[PDB]
Amino acid sequence: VTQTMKGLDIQKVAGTWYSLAMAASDISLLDAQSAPLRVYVEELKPTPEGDLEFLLQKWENGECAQKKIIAEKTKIPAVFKINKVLVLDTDYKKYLLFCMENSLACQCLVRTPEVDDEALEKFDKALKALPMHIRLSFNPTQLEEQCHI
Amino acid sequence: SVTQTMKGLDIQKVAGTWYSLAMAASDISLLDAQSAPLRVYVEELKPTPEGDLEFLLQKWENGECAQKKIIAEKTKIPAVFKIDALNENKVLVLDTDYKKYLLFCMENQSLACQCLVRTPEVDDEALEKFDKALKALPMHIRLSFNPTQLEEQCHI
Ligand SMILES: CCCCNc1ccc(C(=O)OCCN(C)C)cc1
């Protein structure tokens, strides 16, 4: 992943998000509820030091676990270290596109638990240069359920 | 569910070798596991003397790769077939050029579609036409397979 967001203002990504769609380089990264990169972003909280706190849900040992993880800033405003987190694009008010790279998985986040045509079209365009072998998308009912069940 | 069928399908010309390059389904659970209900790999098509279409496929069953044969019976629409199985179903051929790619769906309402290729290689045209076809359909999971997997039992 090289195409990261120019001019990111991380403070404007604060608040609630919903994982609408995800894609990964390897089927095993996303295929099961327990798959390693099957994670649902529920909130982003930029820190006073310019780090990025993720609140996510992840299926572990038969429960939907909530995790709070700090992604530490790097010299590239759009790149953090949790894996590298790369923010490809956001309009702050509607969508955010990011990837996790070690293996590669990318997500389309939306501000409201609804399908957004613009967000998904931009996600598809961003994935054209990336060697993805699994793509998932979630319905509005799933977005509001613990671990998108 | 599926609006697009192949006009003027000649089932004799779809006969022979195929490989499942990509698949997509309306419900993640139809395709997410090696054991998922619509996770099947088409290896060969055989038209019958009655104009039915026999699918020779691989399916993960009892933790091993099994060979299975499924007859999709002809209907009054050339590109639409029906498997004698408990559940109401349709097999729909969306598009083929016969010599490189074939796009089909299974409707059960559950829906899964596949991109078949003649040669066990990633084909840009096959995948681009598959993706265009899927824009019309409410898919929540898409898988694609590397050329090594195409020639392994059950795409392992
Ligand atoms: C650049 C403007 C940043 C303003 N911040 C926000 C603006 C909007 C939202 C938000 O969630 O809006 C959803 C409603 N649709 C119409 C936008 C969340 C944060």
- Return the bridge partners of A63, or none: A60
* Pairing status of strand B141-144 against strand A134-137: antiparallel
Which chain A residues are closer than 8 Å to B146 by Cβ? 133
**Coil, strand or helix at A139:** coil
Place of tokens 């496929």: B57
Cβ atoms of residues B21 and B117 within 8 Å:
yes
Q: Residue B12 gets which letter from DSSP? A: H
* Pairing status of strand B64-74 against strand A104-110: unpaired
| H-assigned helices in chain B | 11-14, 124-134, 147-150
Q: Whose CA is nearest to atom 19 of ligand 1?
A: A93
Q: Does B141 touch chain A (CB under 8 A)?
A: yes
Burial class of A17 by CB neighbour count within 10 A (0 to 12, 13 to 18, 19+): buried
CB neighbourhood size of A39 (10 A):
22
Question: Distances in Å between the alpha carbon of B95 and those of A93, B14, B57, B109, B116?
Answer: 40, 11, 20, 22, 11
Where on the phi/psi map is residue B134: left (φ > 0), alpha (ψ -120 to 50), or beta?
Answer: alpha
Cα–Cα distance measured from residue A118 to residue B141, given in angstroms and rounded to the nearest whole number: 19
Q: Give, in words, the CATH class of B11-150.
A: mainly beta
Give the phi and the psi of residue A148 in degrees, each rounded to 5: 55, 30
Question: What would the two tokens of residue A74 be?
Answer: 């790097």
Say which amino acid occupies A120: L
Cα–Cα distance measured from residue A84 to residue A82, given in angstroms and rounded to the nearest whole number: 6
Question: What would the two tokens of residue A40 be?
Answer: 């649902």
Cα–Cα distance measured from residue A84 to residue A60, given in angstroms and rounded to the nearest whole number: 22
Cα–Cα distance measured from residue A131 to residue B19, given in angstroms and rounded to the nearest whole number: 20
Place of tokens 């045509």: A117
The residue of chain B with its CA nearest to that of A35 is: B32
Cα–Cα distance measured from residue B152 to residue B156, given in angstroms and rounded to the nearest whole number: 6
**Coil, strand or helix at A136:** strand
Question: What would the two tokens of residue A124 be?
Answer: 């598809």
First to last CA, chain B: 31
Question: What would the two tokens of residue B79 be?
Answer: 């590109």
* Ligand 1 lining (C-beta closer than 6 Å): A 12, 15, 92-94, 111-112
Cα–Cα distance measured from residue B126 to residue B151, given in angstroms and rounded to the nearest whole number: 18
CB neighbourhood size of B20 (10 A):
22
Q: Give, in words, the CATH class of A10-144.
A: mainly beta
User: What technique determined this structure?
Assistant: X-ray
Q: CA nearest B105: which of B96, B94, B97, B116?
A: B94
Q: Which of A32, A137, A139 sits opposite B32 (nearest CB)?
A: A32
Q: CA nearest B27: which of A142, A117, A118?
A: A142
Q: CA nearest A121: which of A140, A133, A105, A108?
A: A108
Resolution in units of Å: 1.8
**Coil, strand or helix at A118:** helix
